[PDB]
């Protein structure tokens, strides 16, 4: 789920 983590994004920049």
């Amino acid at each position, epitope marked *: *789920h*983590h*994004h*920049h």
Partner: single-chain antibody
Amino acid sequence: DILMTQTPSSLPVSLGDQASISCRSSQSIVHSNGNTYLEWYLQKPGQSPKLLIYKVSNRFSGVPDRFSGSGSGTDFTLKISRVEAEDLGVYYCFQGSHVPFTFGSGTKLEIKRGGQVQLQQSGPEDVKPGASVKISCKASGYTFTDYYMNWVKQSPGKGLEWIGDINPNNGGTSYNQKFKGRATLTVDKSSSTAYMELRSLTSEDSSVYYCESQSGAYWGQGTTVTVSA
């Protein structure tokens, strides 16, 4: 792991002309929240990469609409109408939708011939193989803990590589497995400084290391780590 394929690698152009760069992902980079974290960067020789386009088509504050991003799913395009001397350099696409984030191989936009927030990185390091190194990134001009801090490696070997990131506020981390836990990201709130520790260094770790925050909007000048016996 998503592979970003950039085309073409070399793009000769005359001033005033229109350049068009393509980028393709090995698989969809549509994030589950609905966004598509596709970014375009421009790097001039001797400098750090600079953000041009994010989320496929948003222009970073300050970038002229001569630069235009488009695309969808796995197909993306960057178009520069009426190229200027300032546009010359190497362009990179990047996906920040799925960990580990990855960059394209790059496109060299060169001329046809004929006829205040800032990130300060620590000094260069020269170490012996098997040794360990620790570089810093002092932040200022913004709230250090409101944004994730990213670390990027750059070597002629494989261009740009995302190492991992850290939430300065709570210590939450995200790492690129390719580094096999040899990298440790830490932080110091009191001084708004981020740190990166890399151990068991080999010649392959010799590169320029960058810290970048606010989703690639700000970069450090980079730190050169040379590993020689």
